[PDB]
C-alpha cells in the first residue's frame, strides 16, 4: 500500500584531493537506479525506472543531478577548509532523500544528511537546519548553505513537486514488478546435550511471511526468527530456529504461510 522512495548517496573524502560519490535508489525494497562515481550518467536497474517522464524531462533532471554531484564535491572540500582545523579528513557524508507515498495525492518528502555516520542536518520547509544532538560548529556551514537562495528554491521544488510526481509515475509503470508473488521453498537442518533445529525459507516475495515450528497444532513459542536476508534475484531468505533436547525431534514440523501460496501452507516434518 504505502511505498517509500529512497535516494541514497554515499560520499567518501579520504584527503584534500581524493573523493568518490556513489548513489542507489530504492522504491520499497526494489532497486530502481544506480549511479557509480565512475559513470557520467544515472543507470536504470529496471525497465520502468524512467517512470512516466518524457526523455526531455529525464535528461533535464539528470543534468541537474550531474551539476549537483560536481558542485557537492567542491562544496564539502571548501566547507572543510572553512572549519579547519576543527574537522579533518577522512570524512564520510551520507544523504537519504525521497518521499513516502500515501493514498490520495498525499505524500511526505525528506532529505536527511549524516556526517561520519550520524544524522546531523536536514532540509525542512525552505532551509537547511541542524537536528537535536548536532555539534555547534555546523552552524557556520548551515549559514553558508542557507545563503544560497538558488539551491533552496531547487531543493524545495525537488522535494515538494518533483519527487511525488515522479514516484506516482514509477508506481504505475512498475506495478507488475511491485506486485509480483514469488513462492518460498523450505528445507530443514540441525546443529549443536542440546540440538538446534533450523527451518530455512528462501525465494519468497514480497517480504511479509509467517514461519513457525509446530508439534501438530501446537505452536512452539521457542521458535526464533532470524533477520530477513536478501537473495541476488530480489527475493528474501529467512530462517527460524528451535532449541530442543536431543532425541526429542520426533513429530516437529515447520509451517510456512505466505501470500504467494494461495492457502496451501508449506509443512515440513522432521
Amino acid at each position, epitope marked *: 500500500k504505502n511505498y517509500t522512495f529512497r535516494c541514497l548517496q554515499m560520499s567518501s573524502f579520504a584527503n584534500r584531493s581524493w573523493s568518490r560519490t556513489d548513489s542507489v535508489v530504492w522504491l520499497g525494497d526494489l532497486q530502481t537506479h544506480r549511479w557509480s562515481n565512475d559513470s557520467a550518467t544515472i543507470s536504470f536497474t529496471k525497465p520502468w525506472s524512467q517512470g512516466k517522464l518524457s526523455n526531455q524531462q529525464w535528461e533535464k533532471l539528470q543534468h541537474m543531478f550531474q551539476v549537483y554531484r560536481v558542485s557537492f564535491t567542491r*562544496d564539502i572540500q*571548501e566547507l572543510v*577548509k572553512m572549519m579547519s582545523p576543527k574537522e579533518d579528513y577522512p570524512i564520510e557524508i551520507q544523504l537519504s532523500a525521497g518521499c513516502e507515498m500515501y493514498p490520495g495525492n498525499a505524500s511526505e518528502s525528506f532529505l536527511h544528511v549524516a556526517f561520519q555516520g550520524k544524522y546531523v542536518v536536514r532540509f525542512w520547509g525552505t532551509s537547511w537546519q541542524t537536528v537535536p544532538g548536532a555539534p555547534s560548529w555546523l552552524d557556520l556551514p548551515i549559514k553558508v548553505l542557507n*545563503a*544560497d*537562495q538558488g539551491t533552496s528554491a531547487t531543493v524545495q521544488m525537488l522535494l515538494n513537486d518533483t519527487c511525488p510526481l515522479f514516484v506516482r509515475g514509477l508506481l504505475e509503470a512498475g506495478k507488475s514488478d511491485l506486485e509480483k508473488q514469488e513462492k518460498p521453498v523450505a528445507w530443514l537442518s540441525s546443529v549443536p546435550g542440546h540440538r538446534q533445529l533450523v527451518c530455512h525459507v528462501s525465494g519468497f516475495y514480497p517480504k511479509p511471511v509467517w514461519v513457525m515450528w509446530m508439534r501438530g497444532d501446537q505452536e512452539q513459542q521457542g521458535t526464533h526468527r532470524g533477520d530477513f536476508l536478501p537473495n541476488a534475484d530480489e527475493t528474501w531468505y529467512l530462517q527460524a530456529t528451535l532449541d530442543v533436547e536431543a532425541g526429542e525431534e520426533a513429530g516437529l514440523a515447520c509451517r510456512v504461510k505466505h501470500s504467494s501460496l494461495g492457502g496451501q501452507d508449506i509443512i515440513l516434518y522432521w
Partner: T-cell receptor
Amino acid sequence: KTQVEQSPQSLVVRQGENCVLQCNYSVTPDNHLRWFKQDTGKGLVSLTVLVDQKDKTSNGRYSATLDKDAKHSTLHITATLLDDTATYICVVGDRGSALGRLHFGAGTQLIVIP
Amino acid sequence: AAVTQSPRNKVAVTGGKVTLSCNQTNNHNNMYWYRQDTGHGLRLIHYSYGAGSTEKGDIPDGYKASRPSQENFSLILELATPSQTSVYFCASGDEGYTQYFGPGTRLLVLE
C-alpha cells in the same frame, strides 16, 4: 582558452552614440553575472547583477540582459558620455554563496570621442 | 562595506621582500587576493575563511598569504620577481556571494 569571453576587445564611439558589449561564458553552474566598470588606474564599480534565467536590468543609461540557456549577456550603454571611457568587465559567479569562485572576463575597452 | 589596501603603489627590486596589506572593518570572515594583468581577467592567488586560515587560489606560486586577524589579510612576496609586476586587488565577504573589492595596489619589480 578561458571560460568567460568578452567582445569586442575594444571599440571607439562618438559621444551620444549607443553601444553594445557582449559576454559569452561556459562556466557551470552559472548562479549570477555582474558587469563592472573600471576607469583607467582605478577600481571596480558594479553596474548591475543578473540572476534569472532570462533577466533584464537597468541602471540609468546602462541596461543589461542575461540568457542562461545561451550563456550570453549584453551590456547596453545609451547616449555615451566622455566619462564612459573605461574598461568593462564581465564576471560569472558559480555559487549563490561564499563557496563560489568568480570567473572574470578580460574586459572590453571603450573610448568615447567627445 | 569598505576595504582598504596599503601601499597603493610600490617600486621594488628583484630578490627583495614585498608585503601587500588589506584591511577590512566589516567583520567579514572571508578575504581574497587577486592580480590583474593585461589580456587576462582577475586571477585568484590566495584566500582566507578566517584568522589563521589561508588557502591556495588558482595561481599561488611565488606568494605567501597571512591572516593574523579578522581585519587584516596580507600577501607576501618573499623573493620578488619582475613577473609579479601587476595590479593586486583584495576583497572581502560574508556568507553571501558578493565580494567587496579594494582600490588596488600597483607593484613594479625592477631588475
